[PDB]
């Protein structure tokens, strides 16, 4: 089997909230390698998040998450975990699980990533004074709001695709 | 004090077959306590996960073609591609793993110079044209999912206030 890393557990979280990520490893001897988490912010900046030794005795964190995030592993289930707590707006990112080759290089295989979205705490305070009809109205005007912007992305990429398709046809 | 990894240029417009060189400068020396320099280069295609290309400054990862060359010492490091192929287009990141916190550079995007026309495609092989077409879907799916997540930040506070009132 080829190496596979599958992250899960991402989703929507309120400021100060908590969330635990998992990474299911297959296709290699999980217990023989150090493992890490790396996140990519919406600006596409890559940030190392945490690393754990092959047997779990040694952990490493940058100060941005230390005391808030915990990396752990279960070598019998071939699973890596990231416990996130006291979450901040700056923690919104796609979170990647990656294996190491200890002593040689840091991130030699990466998973597909799982998205963690920390909402803004300002909304919760704002709509606390809103009526039920006014609340339910905005909720309804949101689904066509979304499906419109999703269609505009499809059209944009349909236009990007045509010149490539046309070039292939002109061969 | 953290080491900052600074990449130059931020955007590298090239044509297929061009030579390319990307700079990575560290704000401090990055020699690990064990004497090795853990300078790594990663390549990411938009909407996809990064992949290791070069480790310990100049060593090619398994499966990386001969046209990639990494070099440097002290604080100045360079990734060179002798002849750019269509599979090389993407964002290159450097990374230092010598001093905690381990840090990435800001990324350099190797992209085609297109202009306002699409005639540069005429000289591409059909294989390379297919590659370019297929690389568009991961970009699209990521943009759509960013809209999907953005409208979850909009609905959840509303549904919370409804369930609490």
Domain extents for chain A? 4-121, 130-169
Question: What whole-number distance in Å separates Cα of residue B20 and Cα of residue B10?
Answer: 13
CATH fold of A4-121, please? Immunoglobulin-like (2.60.40)
Closest-CA residue to B41 (of A171, A18, A33, A106): A106
Residue B127 lies in a domain: no
Question: What whole-number distance in Å separates Cα of residue B85 and Cα of residue B128?
Answer: 9
CA dihedral A140, A144, A145, A147 (to 10 degrees): 140
Give the 3-state secondary structure of residue A113.
Answer: coil
Q: Do B50 and A44 touch (CB under 8 A)?
A: no
Contact between residue A47 and residue B104 where contact means Cβ atoms under 8 Å apart: yes
A122's tokens: 């300002």
Give the 3-state secondary structure of residue B146.
Answer: helix
Contacts of B100 (CB under 8 A, 6+ apart): A60, A62
Please tell me the total number of residues recorded for chain A in this structure: 171
Contacts of B131 (CB under 8 A, 6+ apart): B86, B87
Contacts of B80 (CB under 8 A, 6+ apart): B19, B20, B21, B22, B68, B69, B70, B71
Please name the member of B55, B136, B151 whose beta carbon is closest to the beta carbon of A142: B151
Question: What whole-number distance in Å separates Cα of residue A104 and Cα of residue B48?
Answer: 24
CB contacts under 8 A, A 59-88 vs B, are: 60, 62-64
Residue B161 lies in a domain: no
Q: Give the chain B residue nearest A119 (alpha carbons).
A: B153
Closest-CA residue to A38 (of A107, A105, A95, A88): A95
DSSP state of A50: E
Which of B149-156's residues contact partners 24+ apart within 8 Å by CB, and which partners? B149/A12, B149/A115, B149/A117, B151/A142, B151/A145, B151/A146, B152/A12, B152/A117, B152/A119, B153/A12, B153/A117, B153/A119, B153/A120, B153/A123, B154/A123, B154/A142, B155/A139, B155/A142, B156/A12, B156/A14, B156/A119
Question: What whole-number distance in Å separates Cα of residue A51 and Cα of residue A48?
Answer: 8
Residue B128 lies in a domain: no
A57 and chain B in contact, CB less than 8 A = no
Q: Do B101 and A167 touch (CB under 8 A)?
A: no
Partners of residue B165 in chain A, C-beta under 8 Å? 132, 135
Best to test chain A binding among B43, B56, B102 (most A CBs inside 10 Å): B102
Contacts of A1 (CB under 8 A, 6+ apart): A26, A27
A107 and chain B in contact, CB less than 8 A = yes
Closest-CA residue to A105 (of B151, B95, B112): B95
Partners of residue A119 in chain B, C-beta under 8 Å? 152-153, 156-157
Question: What whole-number distance in Å separates Cα of residue A44 and Cα of residue B139?
Answer: 13
Question: What whole-number distance in Å separates Cα of residue B64 and Cα of residue B45?
Answer: 15
Chain A, chain B: beta-carbon pairs less than 8 Å apart = 137
Contact between residue A79 and residue A7 where contact means Cβ atoms under 8 Å apart: no
Question: What whole-number distance in Å separates Cα of residue A73 and Cα of residue A78?
Answer: 8
Give the 3-state secondary structure of residue A40.
Answer: strand
Give the 3-state secondary structure of residue A105.
Answer: strand
Reading phi first (left if > 0) and then psi (alpha if -120 to 50, else beta), residue A41 is in: beta
Question: What whole-number distance in Å separates Cα of residue A63 and Cα of residue A49?
Answer: 9
Contact between residue A83 and residue A112 where contact means Cβ atoms under 8 Å apart: no
Q: Do A105 and B38 touch (CB under 8 A)?
A: yes
Residue B114 lies in a domain: yes
Question: What whole-number distance in Å separates Cα of residue A23 and Cα of residue A7?
Answer: 4
Q: Write out the residue range of the structural domain in which residue B26 sits.
A: 5-118
Question: What whole-number distance in Å separates Cα of residue B144 and Cα of residue B165?
Answer: 32
Best to test chain B binding among A10, A39, A46 (most B CBs inside 10 Å): A46
Bond into B101 cis (ω within 30): yes
Specify the resolution in Å. 1.8
Please name the member of A38, A42, A164 whose beta carbon is closest to the beta carbon of B133: A164
How many domains does the structure of chain B reveal?
Answer: 1
Domain of B58, CATH number, reads 2.60.40.10
- Method for structure elucidation: X-ray
Residue B131 lies in a domain: no
DSSP state of B46: T
Residue A133 Cα to chain centre, angstroms: 35
**Cα→Cα distances B118→A24, A95, A104, B111, B134, Å:** 43, 36, 43, 14, 17
Distance from the Cα of B20 to chain A's closest Cα (Å) equals 22
Q: Do B161 and A165 touch (CB under 8 A)?
A: no
Closest-CA residue to B53 (of B84, B95, B17, B16): B95
Count CB atoms within 10 A of the CB of residue B112: 17
Closest-CA residue to B142 (of B57, B49, B39, B54): B49
Q: Do B95 and A106 touch (CB under 8 A)?
A: yes
Residue B93 lies in a domain: yes
Closest-CA residue to B68 (of B40, B76, B60): B60
Residue B143 lies in a domain: no
Residue B132 lies in a domain: no
Partners of residue B54 in chain A, C-beta under 8 Å? none
In degrees, rounded to 5, the angle at the alpha carbon of residue B94 between the alpha carbons of residues A11 and A72 is 40
Closest-CA residue to A59 (of A43, A45, A48): A48
Radius of gyration for chain B, computed over Cα atoms and rounded to the nearest angstrom: 20
State chain A's maximal CA–CA distance in angstroms.
63
DSSP state of A159: H
């Amino acid at each position: 089997m080829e190496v596979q890393l599958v992250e899960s557990g991402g989703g929507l979280v309120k400021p100060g909230g908590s969330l635990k990520l998992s990474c299911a490893a297959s296709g290699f001897t999980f217990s023989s390698y150090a493992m890490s988490w790396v996140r990519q912010t919406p600006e596409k900046r890559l940030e190392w998040v945490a690393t754990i030794s092959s047997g779990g005795s040694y952990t490493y964190y940058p100060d941005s998450v230390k005391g808030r995030f915990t990396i752990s592993r279960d070598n019998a289930k071939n699973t890596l975990y990231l416990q996130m707590s006291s979450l901040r707006s700056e923690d919104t990112a796609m979170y990647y699980c990656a294996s190491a080759y200890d002593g040689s290089y840091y991130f030699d295989y990466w998973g597909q990533g799982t998205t963690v979205t920390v909402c803004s705490g300002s909304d919760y305070e704002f709509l606390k004074s809103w009526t039920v009809e006014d609340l339910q109205k905005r909720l309804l005007a949101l689904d066509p709001m979304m499906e419109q912007e999703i269609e505009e992305i499809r059209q944009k990429y349909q236009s990007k695709r045509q010149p490539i398709l046309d070039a292939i046809e002109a061969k | 004090m953290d080491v900052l990894m600074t990449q130059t240029p931020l955007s590298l417009p090239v044509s297929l077959g061009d030579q390319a060189s990307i700079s990575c400068r560290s704000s401090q020396s990055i020699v690990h306590s064990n004497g090795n320099t853990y300078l790594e280069w990663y390549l990411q295609k938009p909407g996809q996960s990064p992949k290791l290309l070069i480790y310990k400054v100049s060593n090619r990862f398994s499966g990386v073609p001969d046209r990639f060359s990494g070099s440097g010492s002290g604080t100045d490091f360079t990734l060179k591609i002798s002849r750019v192929e269509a599979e090389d287009l993407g964002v290159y990141y450097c990374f230092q793993g010598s001093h905690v916190p381990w840090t990435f550079g800001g990324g350099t995007k190797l992209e085609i110079k297109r202009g306002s026309d699409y005639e540069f495609l005429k000289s591409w092989t059909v294989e390379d044209l297919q590659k370019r077409l297929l690389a568009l879907d991961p970009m699209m799916e990521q943009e759509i999912e960013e809209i999907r997540q953005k409208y979850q930040c909009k609905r959840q506070p509303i549904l919370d206030a409804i369930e609490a009132k």
